[PDB]
Amino acid sequence: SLLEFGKMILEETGKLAIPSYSSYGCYCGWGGKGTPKDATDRCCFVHDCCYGNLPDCNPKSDRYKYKRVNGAIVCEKGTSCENRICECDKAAAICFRQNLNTYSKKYMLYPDFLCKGELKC
Numbered sequence: 001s002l003l004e005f006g007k008m009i010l011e012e013t014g015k016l017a018i019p020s021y022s023s024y025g026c027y028c029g030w031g032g033k034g035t036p037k038d039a040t041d042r043c044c045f046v047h048d049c050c051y052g053n054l055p056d057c058n059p060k061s062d063r064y065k066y067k068r069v070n071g072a073i074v075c076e077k078g079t080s081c082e083n084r085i086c087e088c089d090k091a092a093a094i095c096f097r098q099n100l101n102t103y104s105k106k107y108m109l110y111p112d113f114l115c116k117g118e119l120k121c
């Protein structure tokens, strides 16, 4: 679920999902179009594609379970949708962590008109 993803993001990065990642660049928090602005935005692009691989799943609301094995995220078995959603979220949280070194506040609340063009998954 979105709330679980937000908790995972905070655990991983030390940043609150809202507002650090809810309106960032062209793909974080609201998706759509444009060339991703930087590595963090590319994490969101891929996360959006990942959810897009699951047409008949409901990532915003469906809850999954996971544990930590030392720092590693381990998705625990639930329904097939839950397992796949968890793997999408885990990857995005790791990606955000890997790209904190280039996170830029200038991309928070990024305006929609600066995001044009389709980028295929």
Ligand SMILES: CN1[C@@H]2CC[C@H]1C[C@H](OC(=O)[C@H](CO)c1ccccc1)C2
Binding pocket: 027, 028, 029, 030, 031, 044, 045, 047, 048, 051, 052, 058, 059, 060
């Ligand atoms: C799980 N749902 C999909 C359709 C709305 C959502 C979120 C999707 O893509 C996103 O993760 C983005 C954030 O990057 C998002 C946009 C708008 C609302 C919630 C999430 C796929």
